Assembly symmetry: D2
Homo-oligomer: 386 residues x 4
């Protein structure tokens, strides 16, 4: 089975299946896809909805009449298919004017233009029903040390987000923001490089409750971090507003492989976490079909994204349901991890001799954790060898 | 010149110059140093003070009389040399009982013991005059996915730090805590893996003002991150309580090279930031003299740490003082980065046609940033070619 | 399920299940294992043989009488179980005399001592039946640039291996040598860091036929390289003499996880390669049971190594046997890669206008490669969803 | 200061200063440069020559008449300046027909076309005076495991290079070939990923003498390797035919920063090696002026490449000439590494009791190597603090 239906909340950006295959060393290997045809083809595949950057839907520099016309025909395909727009974003990285950033460009006039460009697209995203507005500052950063004073750049980043927070509050919009972290590329180093850095930054904004994170699998893996661990921290903070799924095979350039490819065990632990934590947002795929592929390989790749999530969902649920796994978890004391360390308080802990002076350190040091047996049960379930 | 004096606030852990050279594949190549002799030799080198883990000063398992005796003779060398103890920490990673962690061990009784072990050493660190108490959770984490539920582990981590916050508040101690992030090693992945992750975690503690970060050069570089950028975020947050200086040559095992070795340009931008931001805490070295070295190579390595900071301090100050550099910074518009984007407010920005409808995008896109000329002036000053 | 047999050629080092758990930040968590108990327990698990470093078997410093006793007891356990010894190696990294190397130490006398220690163990390995003698220069390298002139050190490395070749040739021994590459750890950089570098060096020895490589999964992955691609090149060269199997989750310290853990798709493509190329040597596991484990967890991790190889062997055989995969391989023109580019020579090619002057570049550019549809069939077979 | 002369052999690719700034997330920021203006401007800066890909000089698709005109104008600028063309290469990566490779494309016809396109440019390079023809197989590789059988692809790679060797031998051309390794990007994994892998492959060609390597600083650093060590092995092998100089700050996308930027101490040890080994080929810069720059910044970045090499050349010469460094090298026994381990052979060594039976292992283990004191002298010379 593993057939996606709308109920599975699978979404795709216009820019993913529509990537023409232009990379740093080569030209486009595929023609551009029309936005109406992408909506059509994804609804046929079992997708729930689509997302967009403003310049994906409306070619940069369009007159107001060309814009209207682009939004009308898109909105029509959405009505015709039952497709939703859960999220939208701004392109603040392609046009040469953003070569030193959008919100943190050294030129003040470019920072003002970046904000107006964003605000215009927040109005459109709300009209189309988007609840989450993503911000990926891919050009915010530097290749050299004196080019960007980072404390002042963070003053300008906080100013920009506070300004957008005031704007949606004044308009009464029901939209929240999600910051997408990336450690590098296209800049040598990008500001707010990981989930952690974006979550700490949010706590310094004027209205923190309006902002969360949109982590991407491949981005945290570009810094060699454990993506399931970063998502668990964002969930613990109540800040996982959206998530971008794809694959990455290690620390190198950002590959955007289809979900499931790259680190397959990390994809298994991520699905197990999303499903057991009850995440209810879109399962969004931000990937690129390899430029070796024609348009049928594009839809084959898009279908494999959804198929791999559904296969892993089944294996993670079977794992957690297994009495032998529930037994191995008690053996590794994951139940004791859930008990408070000292709900009796610091003064009872300090007067407790079994916690220190009479604690038998070597009896405790000799208890094996039985983590390898547990992990081989997880490997067996992933591989269907049970 | 480049001669360290106490005034330069250079500090060293007992565990740094005293590392015997035991690594994963080999035995100790040097004898243990007595703590009194380390104090002596570092005061002679121009060091301001020393730090310790409890088990560095008092051998694990010492009776109360062996403990008293170890603290008396140490305290005596400190009085005799004028050496200070600015910071202290707990060893919650060497003894086998901490094989699954201290504060986040799955076994509850080990988590209670880890807290009592810590509290006993907070009392001693306050008595010796330490103002900062560092927490490096090196055993908090996992090699496999089901071994550690990370949301619950963070419940236990927050519980532990809140418990220590209540303890020092109740005792009226003037000590703050600093969390030291590390992405991996000795665990496959460590919780709170970077500066960003530790800063976001602190905002969820009961008394956030009691906690900051103690970043280490080599640790952020093990995730390929820009260490000067991470320190700028911690300074912007008002959370840089302490800093550990050393060298790392890339993403690999944690090398702990002497400061200045590893990424030399990153060391130059770090000193430029510390000195221009007015950091006033200790310049602490957490490094390991290579096990190829005898005890004279140990003191040669320790002296090079301080010499390299003083050379880079001089080159960074000369750079910033140069009128030609001040001119290149105006040319790259670092002065415009300091201007507010929209102090006129969102409604004036929205009614400003020069910010969007009449903005000349291509005139702005054509302005070069002159960042390469600026960076070659920084290279010239670093190398003393001006 | 999936039982290990004799004919599977699974072997283990004495140092793998015998690892006591000591790492750079912690003490041993397990008791030392007796070599004869290791032989017994591994025979019980379905292993075909065991390997050893000389100091695993005979304690460094044992007179020629305890050496006698140690070899006698050990050979007894092998006699009793039918266990074989396919390979042996020298420990030229643990003792402090090897702190700057064995074969390439700057001190001449340490290099002579290193060669005498190796030759003593080549005699023992041959009489126990080993056909392959592994060299892992863990200490050959540097933490700094002027400490080691690498061209001269390669002269010394070549000299050591040529002298070893002369010795086994004058003795008439059947044994061949296999270099084990590793990019770093315990040295900042190790000489002959990858499979590629070791294959090139072998070509400069006086008897290249006596020497091949012994690549390890996690070591090539410490440099972010594709381990199956590196094994395909060692097999193309006719130099894959032995292989070390384990797991690694990224570029970081050497983990030595059990085979299957780490990069699970790389383990699948490795098994598919080994089995389709008909590699017939030992499937040797060089891994470390995590120090979180007691001795039951050690045997559970050793059994998981074998189980994972056998599950992947079955999934890879099913992938290649599937008629739809054979069809997808023809569709991606994997059969056409096996056809010679220009079997009728360079003047044939130059005289062919369809190769240049009349080649339709756009029709060729538009053929899709259908690689994503082939990779999802491989993904379905691995996960048993086919 | 530090002026570039002719005799310094500094060369640049047409594609380096000519890079228009287009990357995977952004459009070109600079106008295209005319090849004759590039020749003029670089002659003015003190460059000795220029290099080119065939499609840098002649637009893909130009008839044999625009080809004529393009070569004529270009040769005119060279005639007028005295600029030389030391090396040339083929673009087998930009056009979509090369999406799965040139020499190792699965389609036979694309491989024939790739060889005809290369041979056409070998004829042009020879008449312009190039002695080295570089091959960079940027598209040779895969993003997935069954897309490319690597043993067969190495058969095709060897076949392509053997046919090129036959062609230049039957023409009597003086030119030699140089393989440029790169571990990844634009392919997930590229074949012959490091200097080591390319040196081993060369040993399997029918005429190994015609082929060497062209390593690039940032490409070996993309795999975390030590670039000076890799160059020492290519020089030991007699295969350093050419070298590409630039900067890279870590394992991430290929940056191509100007030489000196990135890992500055690695650039110091590289210059020290090149100058002490008497390398006499071009010092070629393969870098990209950041897209933040206008054309004045492009020429400022190109001048910085040359300046940095000349400052490092001077600092490295001063380090080796210093009597205290010569003394520190004797103290670290760098003179003793040059002495043969056992010049009087294996039976000499076996008969020597001072090599084993009477060698005092503890006195040898306790000699310190004094490597930190030597490295701080190197650090003092680099920073001009001596
Ligand atoms: Mg991405
Ligand atoms: Mg994304
Ligand atoms: Mg460290
Ligand atoms: Mg530290
Ligand atoms: Mg290993
Ligand atoms: Mg091994
Ligand atoms: Mg490059
Ligand atoms: Mg190059
Ligand atoms: O992305
Ligand atoms: O450390
Ligand atoms: O290993
Ligand atoms: O490049």
């Amino acid at each position: 089975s593993y057939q996606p239906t709308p109920e599975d909340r699978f979404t795709f950006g216009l820019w993913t299946v529509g990537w023409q295959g232009r990379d740093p060393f080569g030209d486009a290997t595929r023609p551009a896809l029309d936005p109406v045809e992408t909506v059509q083809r994804l609804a046929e595949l079992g997708a729930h909805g689509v997302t967009f950057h403003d310049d994906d839907l409306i070619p940069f520099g369009s007159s107001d009449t060309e814009r209207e016309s682009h939004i009308k025909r898109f909105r029509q395909a959405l009505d015709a298919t039952g497709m939703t727009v859960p999220m939208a974003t701004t392109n603040l990285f392609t046009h040469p004017v953003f070569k030193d950033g959008g919100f943190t460009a050294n030129d003040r006039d470019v920072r003002r233009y970046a904000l107006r460009k964003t605000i215009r697209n927040i109005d459109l995203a709300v009209e189309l029903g988007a609840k989450t507005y993503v911000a990926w500052g891919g050009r915010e950063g530097a290749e050299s040390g004196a080019a960007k004073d980072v404390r002042v750049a963070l003053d300008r980043m906080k100013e920009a987000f506070d300004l957008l927070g005031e704007y949606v509050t004044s308009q009464g919009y029901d939209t929240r923001f999600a910051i997408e972290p990336k450690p590098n590329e296209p800049r040598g180093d990008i500001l707010l490089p990981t989930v952690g850095h974006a979550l700490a930054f949010i706590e310094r904004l004027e209205r923190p409750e309006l902002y969360g994170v949109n982590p991407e699998v491949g981005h945290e893996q570009m810094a060699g971090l454990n993506f399931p661990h970063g998502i668990a921290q964002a969930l613990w903070a109540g800040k996982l507003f959206h998530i971008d799924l794809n694959g990455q095979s290690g620390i190198k350039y950002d590959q955007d492989l289809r979900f499931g490819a790259g680190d397959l065990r990390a994809a298994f632990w991520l699905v197990d976490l999303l499903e057991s934590a009850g995440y209810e947002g879109p399962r969004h795929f931000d990937f690129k079909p390899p430029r070796t592929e024609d348009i049928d390989g594009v839809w084959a790749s898009a279908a494999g994204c959804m198929r791999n999530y559904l296969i892993l969902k089944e294996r993670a649920a079977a794992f957690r349901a297994d009495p032998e796994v529930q037994e191995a978890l008690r053996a590794s004391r994951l139940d004791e991890l859930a008990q408070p360390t000292a709900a009796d308080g610091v003064q009872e802990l300090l007067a407790d001799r079994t916690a220190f002076e009479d604690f038998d350190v070597d009896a405790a040091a000799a208890r094996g954790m039985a983590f390898e047996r547990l992990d081989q049960l997880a490997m067996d379930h992933l591989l269907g060898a049970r």
